[PDB]
Design a protein around this nucleic acid. Structure first.
Ligand SMILES: Nc1ncnc2c1ncn2[C@@H]1O[C@H](COP(=O)(O)OP(=O)(O)O)[C@@H](O)[C@H]1O
Ligand code: BEF
Ligand SMILES: [Mg+2]
Lengths: 477, 431, 104
DNA sequence: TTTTTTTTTTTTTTTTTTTTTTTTTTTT
DNA sequence: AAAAAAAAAAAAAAAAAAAAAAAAAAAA
């Protein structure tokens, strides 16, 4: 076995193929010799050989399932040569598959025999396989024989693109991490793929989501998050940071709750100078809060975590670069687009937007004005007493309430607090409208268009100073 | 190239968008009063080609090329030129499949020299190689004569005459590009040496460290299979410090990537050697190519000057003791006696010599266009008429854009553009 | 029929080099340096060197060389990244920014 | 209609090329 | 004594490359 792996790593057939078919339905060496010459042997017989080996492997898996002292060593040995042979098949198929798409009919043929071998390998892996390999090193080597070719194949981009093969590989890895106790090896392989490639972050995120949701196993993703937090990067490549950022964004958008557990340590990544990493962290926090605000049980469980993530979201508005501020503005926009609680956070967002309208970054200005527009569109002060706000009318109502002022006491207190909050919001909106009318004369076409849209929305939601901006817009001719 | 239309907007006198078309690809002449804008049209044509010397076309900086500095309302100055790629022989190497090529240069108070090719933003370099590939190298022109510089042609240094000769047969566009390639390769070798230094300095000790970590695992594996007693368990617990259970896959990946890096480095060195050898053989060839070009241009120059003036001759010779590659000078013979110094020649004679040299260069390899500004300033009426007739009849080949104030050349001009300063700006009309 | 394929590959590679579409990813796919070494491609019908084609080949070779150097550099960066295993906040004061139509 | 890919266009940072003086020099 | 070429270095300005956002065409 070990000598066979050492040799393999260091390094008219049709007549014998029919003989092997009949025997299966020193012959062992003949099959290996036949399988060793795939690059030269015709593509016709390869399909039949792959189908035959898949059928034999499925039959043996069914026999093992039916059975479960017994003939344990014999079955273990037979599975060992079958695993070696399927590894040889996988290596020879990824050979020239790396060559193609680097023609297309051969690509379809190779992919089809690949899904056949994937069903065969899933049928193999579905069994417990624990008692037959008593020693952990033997099990580790046997399953590495299966997994390493899978990662070498995932190195190829179309393999990751094709959904059937992607799903089969994800299922294989999920079953492994769930039952064979190889979380460390799988995590190391995934981290190597992430640090060496850019097209596997989405694959890793989807695999982690599948493992979590359909196996109740968050340990692998928690360990991956801890390792990502503790890693350090060099300035020259930035490809590792970019892949990590993409993986974090995808994981946040898919499954936020599980990653919330390790986000406390993940936050430490913000101290790095990586623009991509900082943007990914802030966008991940925003996605987590946005997709966790839906579940009242989730708020009741993670009030403190959601509060600290939101607080970091407001605090990250101050940075030298504009990109993290822009990502924080999108996070705030998602939060305010959510129809939920945290009117205090909404008021803080309003204050931050009106304060940051004067940023030197045109992108940040555009995003702040868009945030203010969405705030105007979905302000909480519209459930009762209409949806139109006016300074004089609100002041008159506040004065009337003050003049009129247990149950009645608390009702008046709540009404006064609501009116004061509305007055503050309207004053902030008036200041924002004045600043946006001043800023409208800007070079950026997108900025001008979005400021015009904000002014139109403000005029529609009748405001005393809105006509001012309207005149400014008339002046844009 | 056979330019067919020219668009000038906000450039010097032409403040309004003036589009001039119907360019006859045989002989185009521009006429008008003093200050009408003919030289302004030539300056606009020079602008789009990518001229760098600002003092050349009557200017000091990029701002004064706009109608009235940054003032008077006009803020941007754009010049657009459109050629014809019907003939693929005289076509850009990189744009043979794209007919009707267009080049636009725009200058703004804020921006600087924005270039568009076929509507797509392109760098200044891109248009530089685009125009150099069609012999329109305006930085060292071989077809461009400004106003008042016709009599100074014989006053240029022998190095500039050598550059003029090298502009033909593709000898130019090669010295500067080899120099730039050498600079780029020298700069890249610094980075290559840096990567090699990090490869041989830090990565290798890590290689021995991971090899030492590899042995530890081979033993620890046996220890585990026995454990699967108390002293062995204690030893196993104590040895769980540098076990690195996933050392095999990581070390295999590192070795594979290092092998790939070494192969790429070796192939890079091989490519460098091949490029150097190719450059050596190429310049060894261009030496003899320059020899042939010089001989042919000298013969054509002599023939043209003999034809223009019946009792004169001219030739191009190397220096007194230096070879051809050092420089080239002009020798003139009148009657049966050679002239030791060219400073005693007449202004008309100097203009005729310059025209004969330009026509010899055209006869060797005709440039796509030839632009002349006040070429007949020091020529009499008879010589002006003879030059115009010879351009119309015998030379042909290329497209001529000549600014003339005398009837001699534009009387028989195939196409005539007349300029008037009408109202604040300049307008161009047919005939 | 190798001549036609070589000419087609040469034309497409020169077009790509002119278009500035050569980068680190496609560096080890289009090797026109070999065609530069064999100068038969950049020759006319009279065994003469076409210097416009020579300049195009030199430009392509230099661009591919630079792209390959960048690829080697980023691979080395990846190797050190895989083998290697504050106060970014700034006060907001520095973030301040600090009649034409009718007049025109 | 929804999503992935192309590509084009927005700054920001760094790179390349210009033009300034500053001396240095030799033949008449 | 006296007139004009010429090598040399730093400051300013044009310009290219990196990186992300917006817009149009294409496949499921
Ligand atoms: N930057 C500029 N802004 C405004 N006017 C200009 C500028 N440069 C040149 N002009 C005007 O354009 C005219 C150019 O005349 P020109 O074309 O040289 O006449 P000709 O073609 O007869 O030689 C000049 O009279 C000058 O006053
Ligand atoms: F100086 Be003369 F009129 F050629
Ligand atoms: Mg003039």
């Amino acid at each position: 076995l070990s000598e066979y792996l050492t040799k393999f790593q260091t390094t008219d057939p049709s007549r014998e193929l029919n003989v092997i078919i009949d025997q299966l339905a020193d012959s062992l060496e003949a099959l290996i010799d036949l399988c060793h010459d795939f690059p030269h042997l015709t593509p016709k017989l390869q399909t039949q050989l792959s189908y035959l080996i898949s059928s034999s492997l499925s039959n043996l898996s069914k026999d093992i399932k039916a059975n479960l002292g017994g003939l344990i060593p014999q079955w273990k040995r037979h599975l060992e040569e079958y695993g070696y042979l399927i590894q040889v098949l996988l290596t020879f198929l990824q050979d020239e598959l790396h060559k193609v798409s680097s023609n297309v009919e051969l690509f379809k043929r190779d992919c089809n025999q690949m899904e056949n071998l994937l069903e065969s390998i899933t049928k193999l892996l579905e069994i417990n396989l624990s008692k037959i390999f008593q020693t952990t090193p033997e099990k580790d080597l046997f399953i590495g024989l299966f997994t390493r070719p899978l990662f070498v194949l995932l190195e190829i981009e179309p393999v990751t693109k094709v959904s059937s093969l992607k799903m089969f590989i994800q299922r294989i890895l999920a079953m492994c991490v769930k039952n064979h106790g190889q979380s460390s090896s799988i995590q190391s392989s995934l981290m190597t793929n992430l640090t060496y490639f850019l097209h596997l972050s989405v694959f890793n995120a989807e695999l982690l989501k599948l493992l979590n949701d359909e196996y109740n196993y968050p340990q692998l993703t928690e360990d991956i998050l801890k390792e990502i937090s503790t890693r350090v990067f060099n300035a020259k490549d930035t490809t590792g940071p970019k892949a990590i950022s993409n993986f974090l964004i995808k994981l946040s958008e898919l499954s936020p709750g599980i990653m919330l557990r390790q986000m406390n340590l993940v936050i430490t990544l913000l101290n790095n100078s990586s623009i991509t990493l900082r943007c990914s962290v802030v966008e991940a926090c925003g996605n987590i809060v946005a997709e966790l605000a839906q579940d009242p049980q989730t708020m009741e469980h993670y009030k403190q975590q959601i509060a600290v993530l939101i607080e970091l979201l407001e605090e990250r508005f101050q940075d030298s670069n504009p990109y993290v501020r822009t990502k924080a503005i999108q996070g705030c926009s998602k939060i305010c687009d959510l129809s939920s609680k945290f009117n205090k956070s909404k008021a803080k967002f309003t204050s931050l937007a009106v304060r940051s309208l004067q940023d030197r970054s045109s992108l940040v200005r555009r995003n702040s004005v868009k945030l203010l527009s969405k705030l105007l569109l979905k302000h909480p002060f519209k459930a009762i007493h209409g949806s139109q706000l006016r300074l004089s009318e609100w002041e008159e109502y506040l004065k009337g309430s003050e003049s009129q002022l247990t149950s009645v006491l608390m009702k008046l207190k709540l009404m006064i607090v609501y009116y004061k909050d509305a007055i503050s919001f309207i004053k902030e909106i008036h200041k924002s409208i004045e600043l946006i009318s001043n800023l409208l004369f800007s070079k950026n076409r997108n900025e001008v268009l979005e400021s015009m849209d904000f002014l139109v929305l403000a005029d529609a939601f009748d405001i005393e100073l809105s006509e001012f901006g309207i005149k400014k817009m008339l002046h844009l001719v | 190239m056979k330019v067919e239309e020219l668009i000038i907007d906000g450039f010097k006198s032409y403040a309004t968008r003036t589009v001039i078309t119907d360019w006859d690809p045989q002989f185009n002449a521009i006429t008008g009063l003093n200050g009408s804008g003919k030289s302004n049209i030539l300056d606009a044509i020079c602008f789009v080609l990518g001229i760098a010397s600002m003092s050349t076309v009557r200017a000091s900086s990029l701002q004064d090329l706009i109608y009235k500095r940054g003032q008077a309302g006009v803020t941007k100055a754009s010049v657009t030129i459109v050629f014809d790629n019907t003939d693929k022989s005289n076509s850009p190497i990189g744009f043979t499949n794209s007919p009707q090529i267009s080049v636009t240069r725009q200058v703004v108070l804020g921006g600087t020299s924005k270039y568009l090719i076929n509507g797509h933003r392109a760098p200044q370099q891109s248009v530089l190689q685009l125009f150099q590939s069609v012999q329109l190298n305006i930085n060292n022109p071989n077809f461009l004569i400004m106003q008042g510089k016709i009599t100074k042609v014989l006053n240029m240094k022998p190095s500039e005459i050598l550059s003029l000769i090298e502009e033909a047969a593709g000898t130019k566009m090669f010295e500067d590009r080899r120099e730039k390639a050498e600079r780029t390769m020298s700069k890249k070798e610094t980075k290559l040496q840096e990567n090699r230094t990090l490869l041989t300095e830090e990565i290798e000790p890590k290689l021995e460290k991971l090899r030492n970590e590899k042995r530890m695992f081979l033993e620890f594996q046996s220890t585990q299979t026995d454990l699967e007693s108390k002293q062995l368990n204690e030893k196993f617990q104590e040895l769980r410090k540098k076990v690195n259970p996933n050392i095999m896959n990581m070390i295999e990946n590192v070795e594979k990537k290092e092998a790939a890096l070494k192969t790429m480095i070796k192939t890079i060195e091989k490519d460098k050697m091949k490029i150097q050898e190719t450059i050596s053989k190429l310049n060894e060839y261009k030496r003899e190519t320059l020899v042939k070009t010089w001989e042919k241009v000298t013969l054509d120059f002599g023939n043209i000057f003999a034809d223009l003036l019946p009792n004169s001759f001219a030739k191009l010779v190397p220096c007194e003791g230096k070879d051809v590659t050092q420089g080239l000078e002009v020798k003139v013979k009148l009657g049966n006696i050679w002239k030791e110094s060219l400073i005693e020649l007449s202004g008309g004679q100097r203009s005729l010599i310059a025209l004969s040299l330009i026509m010899a260069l055209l006869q060797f390899r005709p440039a796509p266009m030839y632009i002349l500004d006040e070429v007949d300033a020091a020529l009499d009426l008879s010589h002006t008429q003879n030059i115009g007739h010879l351009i119309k009849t015998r030379f042909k080949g290329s497209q001529f854009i000549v600014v003339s104030l005398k009837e001699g050349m534009f009387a028989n001009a195939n196409r005539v553009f007349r300029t008037r300063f009408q109202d604040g700006t300049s307008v161009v009309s047919i005939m | 029929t190798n001549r036609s394929t070589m000419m087609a590959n040469f034309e497409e590679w020169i077009k790509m080099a002119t278009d500035n579409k050569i980068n680190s990813r496609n560096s080890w796919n289009f090797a026109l340096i070999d065609y530069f070494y064999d100068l038969d491609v950049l020759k006319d019908g009279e065994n003469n060197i076409n210097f416009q084609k020579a300049s195009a080949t030199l430009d392509g070779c230099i661009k591919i060389y630079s792209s390959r150097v960048d690829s080697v550099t980023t691979e080395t960066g990846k190797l050190l990244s895989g083998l290697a295993q504050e106060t970014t906040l700034v006060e907001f004061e520095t973030i301040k920014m600090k009649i034409d139509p009718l007049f025109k």
